[PDB]
């Protein structure tokens, strides 16, 4: 039997997995987007349904100011005695927090700060002797030596028992991080990612008999990288392993898959699947000695995508993503039932916090996006359409707006330092139906009278100019609704009937 | 002592060095630009002065559709008996060619084509009975097994003796190429390069007793790189090895200066020099263990900017290249003696083959570029300017134009196929100073006028949306004056007075 890599496509990036019996849970990073933190569900290792997020209220998620380069870093996932806790940084606020769940279906906690535990990618353990440890980097603002840092936690006061201490310098590589530890086998292994999160990504591990070391490196480290490589996956790293029931071994972990040449990637970091053998001697290797592809043996796992939108429910679906937290009342289902009646602000895509914009990920190089929208702009500056966003300075969309007391279907751009109306044209009534076609190279941008069926191609736009090299940042494309007042309250409410996803 | 790495700063990859008593010479890869492969003399192997070019006559160098991503790609530069070798690709004709010289201060021989040698790469070595070999990479027209291979070579004929064979695979990482052979010590050394010239570049090396093995890979290989390292040198490799004459050894490679997240280059790759160690056991280990740095330590080799250009002389300086083939009638330095006179054609610089361009390579971050120009456009698509140059879809222009007769200072961008007016300003003289102030990660476009001495910012550019990574090739950004008619002749001439690069 086989599966493909990725196993969770699109922008899903540091993915943190925890087995309960026969079930298995899985986290990823979600950066300055709301909700924070998808938690997805799988039976097989293989499919992921998702089941929701992680944070989902003010309190546990505060995104003002955050961008696509901070907001919520790697989470990490773990089971004990019933009680589930995700812990996380949110790097906007250099502040490292834990929330708890015995209900997944219901919400989780209020956060508990760790205060004087700085770092990226926190991770927990608990030991046979009832001692729980964090692990995470060194901290910056500090001026610590580089490494991995561990402590015992006491969870309920969210507090530090003991001494912080230096653990592990990894291999040599920059940048070492997403560490975790584990007990297998009478030992202690500590693994984690080097090289930074782009083409030079490693895994590498090192073991000791006690969980503080002294660690030795695994002398065939790096233990999964495509380095050095022409593969179609890049970027491979930030691992987290798990004994399934049967008990076979397997490693997450997240890859890019780059298009043109210097490799720019713009479906983010995706989530990974790869076996793994123990050696003899006592050491993990993932994959194909160190290396992985985009199809891979399933070994013993039990093997086995249209999505559209009507907003018929007055509760948005897990699809849907904000700009940090959403102003609510911006946003209704209520309002017009069965349509999403959004107003926008004075804030366009070009700024960080909060324009109104709802968006779902861009999950595939080939699919067909598209909307419709009732919408009559009362002023010039008022505008409403559909996104292909990265970040702030990185989005092409199609919109309605208003010029000299005219309507014109527009397609705009926003690359680096320039803004551009790429192509415009009269249009003559209330509604229009906007597509987008995405193929690897090239996003075509159309619209469609929805009285007559008539199709138009407005434009296009590269892919590669929107990519992660390009923008900046830590994340992926999505494909979002949006409207705004363009530096004034737009007085024009906009109307979206339906939104379709259609992968090929 | 100590000296800076890049030792020849600007885009100069593929470094191949030769040693002539205590004389060195040092060619490097030119892609689409004209003349071709450019080469330097040192006493010290750290100063380098550029003497010329090797490849300066349309029989010699045919760039008809030569583009960034084609062209002269790594040259190799050896010495035997009193005749210098030069060994290239066209890439642009997928031929290998060989020429020669026994004057360095004339010119080089007509090519000899070497029929039947695919692949890129190729590079010479003389051996002690009398036998040369030729060496390159493995010919994907043929669909060869990846690796590096090798013939003896007639040097006068132009073809191989007996049989093309695989010598190495390499380590296992993708594109093996840059391949030198040497013999040390009793051993012949294979040299290479493996990862790619991006973030994964790393050199590699092999042993045998013989010419074509069996090689034995260096068990600590790769011997320098900086893959899974922040360092601010990156890209690291395509190396060549040279003993200096009181017996020390060093290597020549490239490596880039990548600014911005995640990292981007645009002053191409740039000639970078580190010594090698001999171990006990028999191999070469450059640098620190593997690494280098900006500041190095000069073993005992003897230690030792302003370039302005008056087009006083009736000889090009050996800064300029042109696009492809210059149309030598389009440039005059007689028609107005001390000027550089330029007729614009229906090229732009949005056009692949030959507009009517002369540039200089961008050699530091932080540099200020400038030009007096006369020109009184005729007509409305007529335009003469100063150029920041990546490639026909990359580049940025401030120009004089014409509209609805009316003469305007333009700052003009084209960044994929985004082509934007960013800036326009009526202009009222015939003559102008344009200069640009570059700093890592913006260019300044700033206008003077002659008679008052009043300076005007126009506008501003990222310099990462000129990277490699960005436009994609091979290349540097250049500094560039052109003229153009926009789909016409251009009927008006312009008239450059002087060109100045003063960097920081
Ligand atoms: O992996 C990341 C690295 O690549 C760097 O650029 O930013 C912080 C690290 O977490
Ligand atoms: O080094 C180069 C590699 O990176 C690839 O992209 O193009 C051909 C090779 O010579
Ligand atoms: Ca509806
Ligand atoms: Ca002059």
Chains 1, 2 share one sequence.
């Not at 799988?42 to 929701?52: C, F, P, R």
């Not at 065939?220 to 490589?229: A, K, V």
């Not at 090239?442 to 191609?457: A, C, I, M, R, W």
Request: charged fraction near 20%; hydrophobic fraction near 35%; proline fraction near 6%.
């Amino acid at each position: 039997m086989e599966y493909s890599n990725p196993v969770i496509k699109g922008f899903y990036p540091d993915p943190s997995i925890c087995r309960v019996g026969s079930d298995y849970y899985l986290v990823t990073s979600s950066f300055q987007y709301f909700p924070g933190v998808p938690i997805f569900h799988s039976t097989n290792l293989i499919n992921w349904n998702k089941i929701g997020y992680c944070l989902i209220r003010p309190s546990q998620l505060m995104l003002n100011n955050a961008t696509n380069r901070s907001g919520i870093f790697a989470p990490t996932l773990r089971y004990h005695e019933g009680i589930f806790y995700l812990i996380t940084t949110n790097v906007t606020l250099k502040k490292n927090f834990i929330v708890m769940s015995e209900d997944l279906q219901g919400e989780w906690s209020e956060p508990i700060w760790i205060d004087g535990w700085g770092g990226i990618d926190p991770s927990l353990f608990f030991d046979n002797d009832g001692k729980v440890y964090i692990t995470g980097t060194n901290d910056n603002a500090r001026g610590e030596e580089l490494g991995i840092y561990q402590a015992e936690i006491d969870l309920k006061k969210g507090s530090i028992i003991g001494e912080r201490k230096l653990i592990w310098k990894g291999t040599g590589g920059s940048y070492p991080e997403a560490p975790h530890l584990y007990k297998v086998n009478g030992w202690y292994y500590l693994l984690i990612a080097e090289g930074g999160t782009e083409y030079g990504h490693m895994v590498t591990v090192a073991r000791s008999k006690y969980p503080f070391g002294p660690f030795e490196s695994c002398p065939f480290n790096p233990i999964l990288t495509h380095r050095s490589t022409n593969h179609p996956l890049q970027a491979i790293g930030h691992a987290d392993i798990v004994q399934y029931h049967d008990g076979s071994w397997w490693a997450v972990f997240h890859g890019t898959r780059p298009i043109s040449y210097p490799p720019k990637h713009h479906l983010g970091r995706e989530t990974c699947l790869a076996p793994i053998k123990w050696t003899d001697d006592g050491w993990p290797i993932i994959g194909y000695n160190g290396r992985i592809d985009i199809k891979m043996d399933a070994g013993y796992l039990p093997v086995k995508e249209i999505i559209e939108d009507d907003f018929n429910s007055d509760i948005f679906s897990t699809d849907w993503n904000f700009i940090q937290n959403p102003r609510l009342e911006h946003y209704s289902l209520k309002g017009r039932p069965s349509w999403l009646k959004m107003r926008g602000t004075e804030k366009t895509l070009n700024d960080i916090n909060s324009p109104t914009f709802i968006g779902r990920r861009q999950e595939h190089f080939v699919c067909n996006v598209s909307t419709l929208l009732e919408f009559k702009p009362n002023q010039d500056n008022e505008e409403a359409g559909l996104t292909v966003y990265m970040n702030e300075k990185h989005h092409y969309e199609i919109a309605l707006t208003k010029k000299n007391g005219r309507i014109n279907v527009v397609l705009k751009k926003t690359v680096g330092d320039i803004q551009v109306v790429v192509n415009s044209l009269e249009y003559f009534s209330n509604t229009i139906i906007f597509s987008i076609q995405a193929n690897p190279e090239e996003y075509k941008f159309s619209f469609v009278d929805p009285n007559t069926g008539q199709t138009y191609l407005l434009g296009t736009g590269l892919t590669t100019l929107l990519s992660t090299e390009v923008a900046g940042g830590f994340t992926g494309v999505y494909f979002g609704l949006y409207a705004t007042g363009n530096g004034k309250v737009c007085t024009a409410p906009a109307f979206f009937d339906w939104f379709k996803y259609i992968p090929e």
